[PDB]
From a paper:
The two gel-forming mucins [name] and MUC5B constitute the main structural components of the mucus protecting the underlying epithelia in the respiratory system. The VWD assemblies are formed by the VWD domain, C8, trypsin inhibitor like (TIL) and E domains, except the VWD’ domain that only has the TIL and E domains. We determined the cryoEM structures of the wild type D3 assembly of the human [name] mucin and the structural single nucleotide polymorphisms ([name]) variants Arg996Gln and [name] that affect intermolecular interactions. The D3 assembly forms covalent dimers that can appear in two alternative conformations, open and closed, where the closed conformation dimers interact through an arginine-rich loop in the TIL3 domain to form tetramers.
The [name] [name], frequent in European population, shows a double role in the conformation alteration of the [name] assembly. In contrast, the [name] mutation, placed in the β1-β2 TIL3 loop, only affects the adjacent residues. The solvent exposed arginine is substituted by a tryptophan pointing toward the VWD-C8/TIL interface. The tryptophan accommodates into the [name] hydrophobic interfacing region in close proximity to Leu1013. The [name] mutation implied a more discrete reduction in open conformation particles showing a ratio of 89:11 between the closed and open conformation. However, it represents a reduction of 35% respect to the WT. In the closed conformation it establishes a novel interaction between the TIL3 domain and [name], and the open conformation removes the possibility of a putative salt bridge between Arg1201 and Glu981. By that we can speculate that this mutation should favor the closed conformation, even though open conformation molecules were observed in cryoEM. On the other hand, the presence of the tryptophan interacting with [name] could affect the TIL3 flexibility important for the interaction. Nevertheless, we found that the [name] [name] could favor tetramerization and thus net-like formation.
Author numbering:
A (entry chain B), B (entry chain A): 901 to 1229
The structure:
């Protein structure tokens, strides 16, 4: 069960329901104690802000705010700023940067992954089953009743369901999206050529497990829609969404090439030292000041990005100075 | 003296004249023995092909052909293919790949640099002064008579001068370009934000020597014009043109960042070995099978790109297997 939000209105519920929805307002992703059901647990709420990015009316996540108890966090411009600043309470968040994901972990079995541009993945602990309300749908392992609204009623309509979870009572109702490729036909050739890597031999192993037709359509639509500068991001996010979805099953796929969605993992290296590499599967467990050499805490689901390969001398990372230190004070 | 052609119709003559010209035909860059003046020297000719890349009618170099004596070379899709295949004659070209440039060198003091996408730089030996005709202008160190046409007449008109050097007698006459930013106003904000790095503190040292106003305008126009997928290339080429122009004076400037025009120099590295780094200034001289350790042959003008840093063991490169070998057979 993973609530996946990425690109322009690509939502995948916990139970495995996929749909599309676009709008310009504030939306609650996961809400606790919906309907005032205070089951002796702290109420946690995650909200997102949508702004127009393009010319055909597509949407994308710009800022994400988290309301954990009395705290309040802000996520924008690739950085985190504390806003609520709760008093006389211990900070529950354990903000950490791994790969190309700004992982934020809680103490109630809630984990968030942020690619710092548009994508976001949510995983929830099994004991919260059947007690969660929000845009992610009720966690009940049933794909037919995930369309429950705030009124605790499942409605087959998608636009109404999406608009029912808005926060600001002044933003207008959302509308149905258009066809990005019809809007930008001249981009179709390049879009298809670039997104054809999904159907290529690279994802042959994944073809047997998951069906990439939906992700292929998502890539094509995303490439078609992205008109302003930054189409490279609009394509890399679309590919990385399917990459993470495949990695969730437990299979490692290498797809990055210096011609398509390149990475620069050598910039952080100081002069004369080379200790950063690209790991498509993602390091299962590493060594840092917080996590000792013996401890691993392999709670990840498989990520990717630049990771520091510490030398045999000082093989313990620091994560504060982006360098490897023998002894952590 | 450097004939610089890059982006969309950005030509800089040997004597230091800058202008713009666009068209869809075959054009001769540098021609020898113009007018049949056979000065007991082999005739060498370099031609280029222009195809539309966009929607507003902008041009760009797709394929470049070289006619050196009886030989004929083709440059397309980031590779070189011999076409003429001259018989009973020694091959004069010494094709070599350094940095992000596919350097092709001749035996008559002519050197070509190719970024493999659109840009091309030409340098000519001083003894050919006053005996060269072509789109690069007559090599005479005078910036007022560089507009000489095939009829050996200097005309202040630019469109007529550009159209007079066409090869195919069937292609239509070239037309005046439009304003890319007026054509694509919604791209103006992103274009200016991205090209503002020219006026930033990074090029403060270069600001004292060369005036980047022309290059700033070129970057803005290039970003505005580029509409189909691949605007990242359309911006990286524009920035790298000014970078190379600055490096020609003899000053090294570092500008690549993992957020703007990134590079992937770790892909070529095999597993367990790290020997590739990014050198903004460019290696002055290296060691390979052709060029021994003692010999350097520092005939470069300052380039940039991924270069192999051989380990102390086997510190001699090979350039054939992209690896360092102790002894070259
Ligand atoms: Ca359900
Ligand atoms: Ca002249």
């Amino acid at each position: 069960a993973t609530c996946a939000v990425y690109g322009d209105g690509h939502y995948l519920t916990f139970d495995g329901q996929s749909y599309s929805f676009n709008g310009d307002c504030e939306y609650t992703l996961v809400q606790n104690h919906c309907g005032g059901k205070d089951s002796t647990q702290d109420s946690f709420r995650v909200v997102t802000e949508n702004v127009p990015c393009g010319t055909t009316g597509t949407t994308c996540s710009k800022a994400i705010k988290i309301f954990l108890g009395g705290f309040e966090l802000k996520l924008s411009h690739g950085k985190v700023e504390v806003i609520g600043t709760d008093e006389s309470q211990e900070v529950p968040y354990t903000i950490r940067q791994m790969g190309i994901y700004l992982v934020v972990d809680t103490d109630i079995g809630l984990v968030l992954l942020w690619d710092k541009k548009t994508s976001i993945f949510i995983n929830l602990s099994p004991e919260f089953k059947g007690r969660v309300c929000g845009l992610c749908g009720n966690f009940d392992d049933i794909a037919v009743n995930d369309f429950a609204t705030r009124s605790r009623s499942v409605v087959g309509d998608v636009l109404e369901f999406g608009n029912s979870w808005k926060l600001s009572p002044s933003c207008p109702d959302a509308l149905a999206p258009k066809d990005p490729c019809t809007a930008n036909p001249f981009r179709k050739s390049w879009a298809q050529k670039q997104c054809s890597i999904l159907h290529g031999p690279t994802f042959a192993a994944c073809h047997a497990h998951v069906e990439p037709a939906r992700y292929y359509e998502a890539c094509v639509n995303d490439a078609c829609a992205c008109d302003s500068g930054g189409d490279c991001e609009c394509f890399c996010t679309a590919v990385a969404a399917y990459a993470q979805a495949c990695h969730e099953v437990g299979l490692c796929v290498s797809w990055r090439t210096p011609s398509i969605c390149p990475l620069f993992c050598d910039y952080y290296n100081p002069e004369g030292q080379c200790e950063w590499h690209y790991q498509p599967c993602g390091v299962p467990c590493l060594r840092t000041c917080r996590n000792p050499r013996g401890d691993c805490l392999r709670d990840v689901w498989g990520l990717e990005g630049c990771y520091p390969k510490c030398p045999p001398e000082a093989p313990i990372f620091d994560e504060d100075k982006m360098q490897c230190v023998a002894t952590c004070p």
